[PDB]
């Protein structure tokens, strides 16, 4: 008798978090068949850094984290380690020594709305870039230049967030894409998340 990991709760969720407020669930004390995901064909992106999907079912880790969020199709490339741009710098930043995988798929038929889906938001302004796995959920008025803002929107003072406004008629590069990031942390503690081959 084996305890299987709750992946469907993460992959098959009614709502995904906005990338700026990305969601993280801990995976522990279960058995995960990773080859099921790698060979699912439903994922437009499946890139693993620090390991190979072929050996995932034979490896064990002490902790597994699933980070989920929605971004544009043309922003999925920024999830890889050592990239830059609006998402990598201001919203979600993977470390350069990242050990895990990056899984995305098109969600135009789930997260798009006629007239725009403004529920999915991204951070547009930030003075310093995000550090790996950092989460900034602030909504303070961003100040550009020297003029103080007094907490009001104006000529040099802007709201830090902006909606995606996903529409089903948008081009594929702009369509919503659900992303799931699996991180494989391994310490000198007992490993609790394993593949079927161990």
């Amino acid at each position, epitope marked *: 008798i084996t305890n299987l990991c709750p992946f469907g709760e993460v992959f098959n969720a009614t709502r995904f978090a906005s990338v700026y407020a990305w969601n993280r669930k801990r995976i522990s004390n279960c058995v995960a068949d990773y080859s099921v995901l790698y060979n699912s064909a439903s994922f437009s992106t499946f890139k693993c850094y620090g390991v190979s999907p072929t050996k995932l079912n034979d490896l064990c880790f002490t902790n597994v984290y699933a980070d989920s969020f929605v971004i544009r199709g043309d922003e999925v490339r920024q999830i890889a380690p050592g990239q830059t*741009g609006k998402i990598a710098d201001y919203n979600y930043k993977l470390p350069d020594d990242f050990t895990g995988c990056v899984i995305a798929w098109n969600s135009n038929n789930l997260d798009s709305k006629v007239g725009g889906n403004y529920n999915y938001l991204y951070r547009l*302004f930030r003075k310093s870039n995000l550090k790996p796995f950092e989460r900034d959920i602030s909504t303070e008025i961003y100040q*550009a*230049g*020297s*003029t103080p803002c007094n907490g009001v929107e104006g*000529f*040099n003072c802007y709201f830090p967030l902006q909606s995606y406004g996903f529409q089903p008629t948008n081009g594929v*590069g702009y369509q919503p894409y659900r992303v799931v990031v699996l991180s494989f942390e391994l310490l000198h503690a007992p490993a609790t998340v394993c593949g079927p081959g161990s």
Partner: antibody
Amino acid sequence: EVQLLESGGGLVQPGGSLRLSCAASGFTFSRFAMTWVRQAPGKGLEWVSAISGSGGSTYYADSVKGRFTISRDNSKNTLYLQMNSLRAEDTAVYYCAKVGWGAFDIWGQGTMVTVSS
Amino acid sequence: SVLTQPPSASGTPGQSVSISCSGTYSNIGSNPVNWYQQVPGTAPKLLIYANDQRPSGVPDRFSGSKSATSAFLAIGGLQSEDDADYYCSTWDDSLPGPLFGGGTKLTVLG
């Protein structure tokens, strides 16, 4: 849709004055901050002045500070630039633009003001 | 307190190019960068806002990038209509208004 029509440009001598005008159309003029940007002949762009939506906040570059006065009239969808003590260096095509997300998204085609002597 | 751009750039149609713009941490490093296209005789058109965001109507071949003290405008698939002058712009923590670079004349060898 969105349109910015500029006028009030002409020739003037050093020490003279001229009031520029830009009429807005196609958008709620009261909700967006406006700005003036000038372009000297054969040279680049330079931010001149900015105004808040209701006029409660004014912003000026040091190169025109104390002389030029920006202002708007929301009762007519028009923004105004009052230029005083004109210098030969103030010669440029003055552009009218709307401020959006830290950038000037929509620009007017510009009016030419000349300081010659 | 001043943004510096290479004065010129050249490319064959179809090629890609990258327009550079250097400064300080007080401008490009601590403030968002914009890009503007201007064909002579017209008004500047906004191409990139917030460093790497394209406003409505701008094709995806125009890309934005930014390093510590420099910003970059990438133009894939150079076309005849891209013969223009491209200006970077950002804010400086010591000034109330935005700064502009000297410009960069991109010549499309059609």
